Symmetry: C2
Subunit: 160 residues, 2 copies
């Protein structure tokens, strides 16, 4: 069994993909049945090519061995992508109560709770934390804080 | 902010790297601030290029979204690499007792235990499971199984 330059590169790509921690040239060498000097060289050539095209992937060598990393300049994109998981979509109940605030704008939660026919603290909270609505003032007659949809609401929704 | 073809490809490479589960074109689209139709197309072009060069990496689309997978034909290499982790290196104590069996070949563990000056069941076991030694016969005088280094021992060691 023997792998030419192009084959060795392939196998190494497959392997560098499945690892969750750096691997050693020796581990790869053994796994692939090749001389380590050959693997060591190949990894540095594959790393050279990737940074040669400024790939999103950066193959770097550390005391723990070799591993594919995210190229520096792309951190910002990595950050956002993951964070766009922290908060799941809005439930229909939530949109429902969002609409109530939207269409009745200055509204106390007491009227939102009544109009929805249920307690709305959980949904109010999330709507608040997500900046879709906010405290505007208070009701003169009752002294209960009033609410309104933010500007961001007009955005995530459409237009302004 | 705008990314040309080559930039979008880079960002998508960085992102497809950090995920531990399929991502959606929309997630990528949102994360990268582009139209999904553009991302969707790009991913299929990047997947086309990879299988165009029979890469070790295969970008595939599933109901859960897009994700980088190990290309089929390379499974065998993936198997070995991981398995070459299951068993850690041999401790000096182990090599020590291995040498005892090697140099005194037909030997009862009673003589290995005595020669080492300690109980050797744990090391005997691993040496056995790893096929470095095996039961050969018994001692006529005492009826205690005797041991010897296998052929594989001659291999992992050097020559034959």
């Amino acid at each position: 069994a023997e792998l030419d330059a192009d084959e060795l590169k392939r196998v190494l790509e497959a392997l560098l993909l499945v690892i969750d921690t750096p691997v050693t040239a020796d581990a790869l060498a053994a796994a692939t049945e090749q001389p380590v000097y050959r693997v060591a060289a190949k990894l540095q050539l594959m790393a050279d090519e990737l940074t040669g095209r400024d790939s999103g992937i950066d193959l770097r060598h550390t005391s723990e061995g070799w591993r594919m990393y995210t190229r520096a300049r792309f951190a910002p994109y990595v950050e956002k992508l993951l964070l766009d998981g922290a908060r799941t979509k809005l439930t229909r109940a939530a949109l429902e109560t969002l609409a109530v605030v939207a269409y009745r704008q200055p509204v106390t939660r007491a009227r939102v709770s009544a109009v929805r026919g249920v307690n709305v603290d959980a949904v109010m909270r999330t709507l608040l934390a997500r900046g879709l609505i906010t405290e505007v003032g208070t009701d003169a007659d009752t002294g209960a804080v009033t609410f309104a949809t933010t500007e961001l609401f007009l955005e995530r929704l459409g237009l302004t």
